Design an enzyme around this catalytic site. Structure first.
Site, PDB file in Angstrom:
ATOM      1  N   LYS A  80     -52.266 -48.706  60.801  1.00 57.83           N
ATOM      2  CA  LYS A  80     -52.677 -49.969  60.056  1.00 57.83           C
ATOM      3  C   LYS A  80     -53.046 -49.428  58.602  1.00 57.83           C
ATOM      4  CE  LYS A  80     -53.098 -54.583  60.798  1.00 57.83           C
ATOM      5  NZ  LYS A  80     -52.875 -55.622  61.710  1.00 57.83           N
ATOM      6  N   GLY A 180     -55.088 -76.031  69.703  1.00 58.35           N
ATOM      7  CA  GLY A 180     -54.195 -75.998  68.615  1.00 58.35           C
ATOM      8  C   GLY A 180     -52.502 -76.391  68.966  1.00 58.35           C
ATOM      9  N   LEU A 181     -52.087 -76.905  67.828  1.00 59.03           N
ATOM     10  CA  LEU A 181     -50.551 -77.133  67.860  1.00 59.03           C
ATOM     11  C   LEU A 181     -49.900 -76.523  66.773  1.00 59.03           C
ATOM     12  CD1 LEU A 181     -50.436 -80.836  69.196  1.00 59.03           C
ATOM     13  CD2 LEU A 181     -50.783 -78.647  70.273  1.00 59.03           C
ATOM     14  N   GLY A 182     -50.030 -75.416  66.428  1.00 57.48           N
ATOM     15  CA  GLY A 182     -49.303 -74.694  65.609  1.00 57.48           C
ATOM     16  C   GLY A 182     -47.812 -74.635  65.959  1.00 57.48           C
ATOM     17  N   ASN A 183     -46.983 -73.802  64.935  1.00 52.27           N
ATOM     18  CA  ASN A 183     -45.664 -73.603  65.291  1.00 52.27           C
ATOM     19  C   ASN A 183     -45.461 -72.840  66.593  1.00 52.27           C
ATOM     20  OD1 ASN A 183     -43.656 -74.209  63.068  1.00 52.27           O
ATOM     21  ND2 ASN A 183     -45.137 -73.118  61.796  1.00 52.27           N
TER      22      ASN A 183
END
Lengths: 364, 364, 364, 364, 364
Positions: A80, A180-183
């Site tokens: 990272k 949640g209704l994201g992509n």
């Protein structure tokens, strides 16, 4: 802070501090483990409290990538990059050009990607100096919307869970709460309907509730009512730490399986869950479709191949359940074990000398 | 003429005289700066008054390419080839074959392209001897009509200007004068209508006025009435030097943003403009979509990528406005500054040793 | 300790922490500057109470190599490795194999060599994993005995030194104090004997004292009065900081020229030595014959060539002098400048694009 | 000056102006012909009042190398570098690094070497940036002392010369005037002494005169009567144009054979020397032992082989003679022809396609 | 037969006899000229009267390829392979495998293709041993029907002729006789109609007459009446030698331009034609579209590029007319001249040394 102490503790290989006064670059590259292959990890750019804080994040995140990549079945290690600065005010060309050069200077030990605070634009700048960056291919760009691929993986991981909970992998008839209704959530829902599953849903954003509702005939609840719902599966697909002391006890669901990162607020909650007997599909394993997808680029991006890769999440989750009994440990714990065992077993079985070993680099 | 004096003045790297009696080749290759990368510049073929004149053009044009390429965000230096002769009577195969060889002999320090007096046919001949030539790919040929790409860049640069002038980047409602209706102008108009902008237009050619008028419902004026028009934006998209003592004072527009080369007749006019407070988007920056487009070929032609590159013109123009205040200089001047600053900053931040630096050549 | 802060302060390129639990490896590779070429710097192994100690030392020593290599006329940057551990008790094979791998992983940005705590045996192990190591060639071992050469270097620097002080450059007649009689010192003496010069010598090792007296008709004085003696030249060839508050006043000689490192306790002293009218030949410049020697190996060792490289010391010392009466600055300050000037000047003049640049790696 | 006009006149390939402000580099690389192979020619550094002077010289000298290399039987073309500046006062490291880079940028079309104004030290710096330089190999330095060889070359050419004049080819008995006694001359003398020949010698350097007299029982005459003396052979080994209107009549000898360049003031003289019946061994052919020597390095230096190459001079001189009574042309004219004939003949006979042609670069 | 005599006569480079008793292979590879590049020529397999006959055909055909390839504007030389045997009874795998190996053994000097008596199958067998074979690409296979490309070239050459005869290149209104209705003729007709030209046609095969007639509304005559027809252009698109003593005098046409090979029965006829004032477009130039098409494969087959190549036939024919006047020679003769001049001029202008010349092989 005592770097060497932290490093030895977990046996990190390297910690790389990159600096370029001219461009204002201050970056920390953390490489935890490369037993399985080159380290792959995003580059995050953020404003940092204290230097120590930055260093600590890098370390911490690289170790996480080690686990995630291993459990995902990839031949990559954990790394990272953390860049100290205001993503909204401090970026310039020059700084990403210098970073790119340092990366090229690691010669394949580390491969970067976009993350919090960096964009494809930034990646393109890095790409002018090295090939050890992923997610920038024109092929990947065309047919590589992470979204669907991630969603596909959650979906698959979900099926393994159902089977463990309920006895079968058909989601047909099941009621599922979608936080949640994201992509990603969007797509998951799709996958669900298409299977004959019932949807209960919520999101801070109305419009989102509507599209989902209209499209797939879902029952929209208020955000706070999400946990109480009487359903079979809870899909936390938004922010993390949603699994806690308040929420846990309200849970009606027997299965937890969502796309969100760091679902548990504490390991404790993981044990709680175990004691309650709720089947939890560890977040990092189940939501890995995204990493798996960028990693395919390394082979020459193939959507269809990526999906198939992603398909193995089912098998990983399944195996996670098995380790759970084998050691009478909570799911979250078994995830780690599986990862660890994979590293060790793969390594042992690759100890034979080859003059021309083959690796994921593929020329690069 | 005193070559060395001119060279030192501006710190040119090289001046290359190529000759081949057999084919009648007389060419001058001028390489001004390669700090950012190989020099890229067209090959122009023309009848020349005096040798000195030829040499002077080459020099002058190569320095210009340095600026243009830098300001365009490309990793290329400035160069130019001037071939002394009648493009209509003196060309032969043999001469382009010799030229190609000399170019191959510069080994990547210089990359050619078509320009005034040379064609794709000529380039193909050069291409039989070297790969350091651009604009000849079958991919580029198929989907690489410079036109649209240039137009797209002017369009984008236009939006940055409007925002600076007017306060917003919507051209919706704006009236725009379009001087010249060439292939580029055509497309620009398109872009405009599609946005809800009003068009005022002219061209020496009727047919052109008609197509434009019919298609996009434009108001066609006579060529000489172009400057007087009451509108928001003037798009000089034809010949240069249109910005002068007669015209300037007639200007009703607050913004100047077109595709034409060398808009100003003198720097003076640039200052005039500044004093009048007309927002001028420097020609060389704003019309760069064409160079940016051939340069993408070097990466393996990708229309979509090229467009995205071109998209940065917005950002370049924007930055040009900012430098303008920062130093209280006219736009035209800031263009130069930006270029210059880019070269210097990028270079400083790339001074770290790499045994295998990567570059735009991509194998070639 | 604020790493980024120290890094930025001098514009360090990189700071690399390498760890290997299994082997107990704990090392820090510091890379100051690679403008002129790959960083060359010895690897030292030593006990460190605080991490910070080690980190600081690394940083510190790497920066010094930048100056030393530059001033020496070499095309190499400055770097250094610090291995935390007891050289007497902590070494193992495995740790050097690991370090060797990390070094190979920097791909030529860093070249190593023996130093405090390490031996050619250690470098040999490193060598099994990388070619980025020097001082291990069979020929080098056959004909590059460091001492002889470093000694040679101090000699020449001494003569250029007499030059400015004692008018001529002959050592003839001259009475010289030789503080410290280790290998390098002996040679300095051999060379000094075989030239018509007389030596007052000192040391803590009795034997040593005898060898010189015998061998070269030298007067052995008490370890603590050496400063005092009336000699033409004082050659500090033992420990550092010998030039401080006490000794400086106590000093007779007009010239200072020995092999020791960090002869000055403080710049202050450098500054003091100055008004005094004493000609101080900068340590790092004058004692550089060993780096130079090891650097030659990069081209395929040649004692001859190496030696010839060394001769350049004279001229370098000389040049330091002029830069002094050019800015009216102390000897020690002019060393620094000469170094930084070379870096900058050389960097500017190599800014031209080349597709196949040549570098000291010589395909390593 | 009309460059293209001069270039065309002799069909020059290229004229390269290199400039580096920072370093003050101003150089001109002239490449006449590369039909036989890469251009080989020394780099000279000298003061020039007018650009034109330098340009002309470059052009001029490069063309000469074409002839010299060809006639010498080498597979190399003709080139030359002219660096404008005071060798005594203007040199620096940076300028040679830059030039070296420009040379690397010509990719083998041009190979350099030491000349008027430059030293092996200068070439070494060039060498850090390119392999296209000669006369710098460790072995070359160990065993290719130019003088010895060039000397050898004049000797053999002298014998082939006696051959045509003085029936046989023995130097035995023979009285020879040696004008000029620098290094090459000494050797010529050593060789001439050790063969039963007697020498009348001259020079401006007294010492020099003594050495020869001593060493070889030679009569030292006045610098201005040398032409006059009754000798068998006149060996001009100093300055040029010694063969002019004054001296020619003043001449006794039947043969002309020395190391000097541009011995003839004018062709006119070459033409005069002709009717006279004096056998003039062409300068450029006879004194070529040094190029040949440096050329060998291109194959991995071998004094032996080099020497054997030199021997060929005899035969070359010989051949020049025949071409003379073959067209009834002056010696000097036949040198030229022999050269041009070799170029053409060799070019025709290598016109067959090969995918992997071999060349003198020997992978440089 | 006297091979060397024939070879010297026309300066052939090589004659290669390949034999393999095991497979019964007897082949003759003739390489006439490779000045322009590798030799490209078909492999013909046939029953041969006498060895001498075979050898003679090979020689003769290779020289022809030299001309054809040069005149076609290709960078290839002339070669041909003749295999002695019954194409209908003697073929086997083994023999083409041996041949392929011999070809690989010529390393790029010669490139084969299918011809009389060999097939794509045979080529595929050769292809298992070498890449120097053309016409076998899957790309070429898909979109590479020679037919249309050849036809397109005849068409274009036809336009140049019309322009020379008639004054314009429009075939609109012109009447054209088409002898033979093969795949090529078919297409040519098409091209013609589409242009508004009138067709008169014939063929030994009815069906053919019909398709053509039906499709394009042509007037079908009997085979023997073809020559008499009252039309503008005669397109001999069948067998050769159709231009002779009987036919010539019957000609009504002013222009002869067809796809057939060896139209003239004798050079004489070529002169006759010239005397009669009939404009004759030399067969070998005008029907070259087929060779040009396989040659494009060498670059990575691109139909569109090939067509464009083919387009140059117009320019070649045009130039042929020009040479005709320039020397007052018949067309057929000028064809040869043009070819010859091209070889000589291109070669002269490519005599500059390059260490990495580029060639048509493209890696192969």
């Amino acid at each position: 802070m005592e770097i060497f102490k932290y490093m030895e503790k977990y046996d990190y290989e390297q910690l790389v501090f990159c600096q370029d006064e001219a461009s204002g670059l201050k970056a920390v590259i953390a490489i935890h483990d490369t037993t399985l292959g080159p380290a792959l990890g995003g580059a995050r750019m953020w404003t940092y409290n204290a230097e120590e804080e930055a260093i600590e994040d890098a370390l911490r995140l690289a170790r996480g990538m080690t686990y995630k990549n291993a459990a995902a079945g990839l031949n990559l290690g954990g790394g990272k990059t953390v860049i100290i600065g205001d993503p909204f005010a401090d970026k310039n060309e020059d700084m990403f050009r210098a970073l790119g050069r340092f990366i090229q200077g690691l010669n394949g030990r580390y491969i970067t990607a976009e993350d919090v605070g960096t964009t494809v634009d930034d990646m393109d700048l890095i790409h002018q100096e090295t090939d050890y960056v992923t997610g920038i291919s024109p092929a990947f760009g065309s047919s590589g919307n992470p979204s669907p691929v991630t969603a596909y993986g959650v979906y698959r991981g979900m099926k393994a869970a159902a089977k463990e909970a309920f006895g079968s992998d058909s989601l047909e008839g099941l009621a599922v709460s979608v936080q949640g209704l994201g992509n990603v959530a969007k797509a998951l829902c799709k996958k669900l309907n298409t299977e004959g599953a019932k949807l209960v849903v919520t999101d801070v954003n109305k419009a989102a509730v509507s599209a989902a509702v209209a499209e797939e005939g879902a029952d929209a609840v208020a955000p706070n009512a999400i946990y109480g719902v009487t359903c079979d599966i809870f899909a936390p697909c938004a922010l993390g730490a949603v699994l806690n002391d308040f929420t846990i006890p309200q849970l009606k669901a027997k299965v937890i399986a969502g796309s969100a990162d760091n679902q548990l607020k504490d390991p404790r909650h993981g044990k709680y869950l175990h004691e309650l007997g709720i089947v939890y599909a560890p977040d990092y394993v189940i939501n890995a479709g995204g990493v798996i997808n960028v990693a395919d680029e390394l082979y020459g991006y193939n959507r269809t191949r990526a999906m198939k890769r992603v398909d193995g999440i089912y098998d990983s989750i399944e195996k996670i359940f098995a380790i759970s009994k084998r050691d009478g440990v909570p799911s979250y714990v078994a995830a780690d074990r599986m990862a660890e065992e994979r590293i060790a077993k793969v390594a042992k079985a690759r100890s034979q000398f080859l003059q021309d070993q083959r690796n994921i680099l593929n020329g690069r």
